[PDB]
Each structure stands twice: as structure tokens, then as C-alpha cells.
């Protein structure tokens, strides 16, 4: 409620961009002296976004334990996300190692492998059933098992095993399609049916180790949809959407990775999937099947 009245307030202002520069100024500013080691230059894919140390993930390797990942870990909502980089042909192997190792059962990837001309993320994942793909340092096996393509955004079922130990798992992966880099979503509709997917699989269960969310640089986009998420998620188990505080949610997150949400434009849209998705939240069920039809995913 008080979002929503706070919402208006900047759109008939026209102030969204003072809003949004306001939390780049009073963002934290921490360390991340591991991610400028010499060594770990081409472990990163932009010069200008590391992990701080103190939320980074470390790898269970003696060698070299660096990945560009942050843990985002949301005391008061209870919910944790690790947000990365998107891979690149040299970090592929240390990404499914860290997924092996948190325990995560969903990635989200919210980018296209190629966007504007340029390659933004390795081809991490194998395309066809037939042709697996061996990580040869990290000793994992990755598998496609099926995938279910909608008309904005695909899930596809892999299977990753420890070539160490033979235990096998499933990653479910969920691809968001149309998304543009520095862009937000087409609807609140069709990332709600997307956001609500990845929570309908079970991949956000505290049973589980983190969801691993990524785009090309792991804070725009990733941000966004972390956001969103977390914001239903504490206005869920206190039923009450006026005790949200959307923008000392992202202070908090930002606590955590640089440079999460980066537009006014994206902050803009989270307010507006926050306060659709409170409808849900607040019991009004079938607002699901609406963001389903508004979505055409079956088009
Ligand atoms: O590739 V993302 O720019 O949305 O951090
Ligand atoms: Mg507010």
C-alpha cells in the first residue's frame, strides 16, 4: 500500500532518476581484493563488477577458490540467492562446481547467450540430449534431460553428476528469453509467471542450498528479479504489503553484490511487479491464471 502511494508519488514527479541515483550514493562500498588479484583476471567477464570478500563464494578447490558469485543472504526474509557473473569458457567447469557444492537446485538465467552482437555467457549448458558435456577440471557431468519451451522463456531439465563419487542430481534451469540488458521486463505479468515458476518447482526451498541467479554481469537483471522476490517474500509471512520498504530492501541486498538493479527503469518496475504480485500474495488467487493468459507463453 504505502509503496503504491509512494509509487505515484515518484512516477507524477517525474523523479525516478533522483530516486534511483540516491540508492547508488548511499550504497555500500566493501572490499573484493580477491577478485582484482592479477590471477583472477580472466575469471571475471567486466572489469568493473566483483565480489565483495566477505559475500563471496569460495570454491572447495586448494588451487584457486575464486568465482565471481556472490551469496545474497536475506536475514529477515529467510531466503538466500547466489548471484553471478554469466560463465565464461574458462569458468564453466567452477560454475557447476559451485552449484555442486552450495547444494542449488535452480539456476535462473535471465540473458541471452549472444545479446546486441556479442557473446554475453558461455554456452554452459549442453543443447541436446545426445551430446553431454564433461567438465574435465572440476570432474562433472552434465546432461540434458528434456526442456519445455514457451513462448518467452524455456526450463529445461539437466542432470548433473560427481564423476568423483557418481552421485547424480537434477538442476532444473529456467531461461528467460526477452529480456534486454538494461532493459525491464515487457509486463509485470509475464515475470510474475516467470518469478512464480522457478517457486512453483521448488528450487527456492530452504531444503535446498541457494538458487543460483545469473544474467551476463549477475546485477541488472539478477537484481531485479531478487528484488521482486524477496519483497513478496516478506510481505508473505507478515500478510501485510504496507510494511514493505522497498528501497531498504535493495540497501540490503546491495549490501551483499555491487550495483544490483541498474536503471531507474528497473527499480520502476520492480514497485510495479511488487505491488501487482502483492495481489497474490494477499489471497487472490486466480491473479495467477491472469499473468498466465496475459503472458501467451503458448504462443
Ligand atoms: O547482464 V545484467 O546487466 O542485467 O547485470
Ligand atoms: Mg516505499
Given at each position: 500500500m504505502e509503496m503504491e502511494k509512494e509509487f505515484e508519488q515518484i512516477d507524477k514527479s517525474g523523479s525516478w532518476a533522483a530516486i534511483y541515483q540516491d540508492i547508488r550514493h548511499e550504497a555500500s562500498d566493501f572490499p573484493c581484493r580477491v577478485a582484482?588479484?592479477?590471477?583472477?583476471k580472466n575469471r571475471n567477464r567486466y572489469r568493473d563488477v566483483s565480489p565483495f570478500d566477505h559475500s563471496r563464494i569460495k570454491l572447495h578447490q586448494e588451487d584457486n577458490d575464486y568465482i565471481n558469485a556472490s551469496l545474497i543472504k536475506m536475514e529477515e526474509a529467510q531466503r538466500s540467492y547466489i548471484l553471478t557473473q554469466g560463465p565464461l569458457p574458462n569458468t564453466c567447469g567452477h560454475f557447476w562446481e559451485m552449484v555442486w557444492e552450495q547444494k542449488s537446485r535452480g539456476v535462473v538465467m535471465l540473458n541471452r547467450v549472444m545479446e546486441?552482437?556479442?557473446?554475453?555467457?558461455?554456452?554452459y549448458w549442453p543443447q541436446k540430449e545426445e551430446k553431454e558435456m564433461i567438465f574435465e577440471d572440476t570432474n562433472l557431468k552434465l546432461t540434458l534431460i528434456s526442456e519445455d519451451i514457451k513462448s518467452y522463456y524455456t526450463v529445461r531439465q539437466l542432470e548433473l553428476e560427481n564423476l568423483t563419487t557418481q552421485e547424480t542430481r537434477e538442476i532444473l534451469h529456467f531461461h528467460?528469453?526477452?529480456?534486454?540488458?538494461?532493459?525491464?521486463?515487457?509486463?509485470?505479468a509475464s515475470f510474475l509467471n516467470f518469478l512464480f515458476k522457478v517457486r512453483e518447482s521448488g528450487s527456492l526451498s530452504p531444503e535446498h542450498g541457494p538458487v543460483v541467479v545469473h544474467c551476463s554481469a549477475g546485477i541488472g537483471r539478477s537484481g531485479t528479479f531478487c528484488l521482486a522476490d524477496t519483497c513478496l517474500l516478506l510481505m508473505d509471512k507478515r500478510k501485510d504489503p504496507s510494511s514493505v520498504d522497498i528501497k531498504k530492501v535493495l540497501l540490503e541486498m546491495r549490501k551483499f553484490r555491487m550495483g544490483l538493479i541498474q536503471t531507474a527503469d528497473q527499480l520502476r518496475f520492480s514497485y510495479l511487479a511488487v505491488i501487482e504480485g502483492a495481489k497474490f500474495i494477499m489471497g487472490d488467487s486466480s491473479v495467477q491464471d491472469q499473468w498466465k493468459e496475459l503472458s501467451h507463453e503458448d504462443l
Open positions: 582484482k588479484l592479477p590471477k583472477n546486441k552482437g556479442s557473446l554475453k555467457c558461455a554456452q528467460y528469453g526477452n529480456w534486454p540488458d538494461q532493459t525491464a521486463p515487457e509486463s509485470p
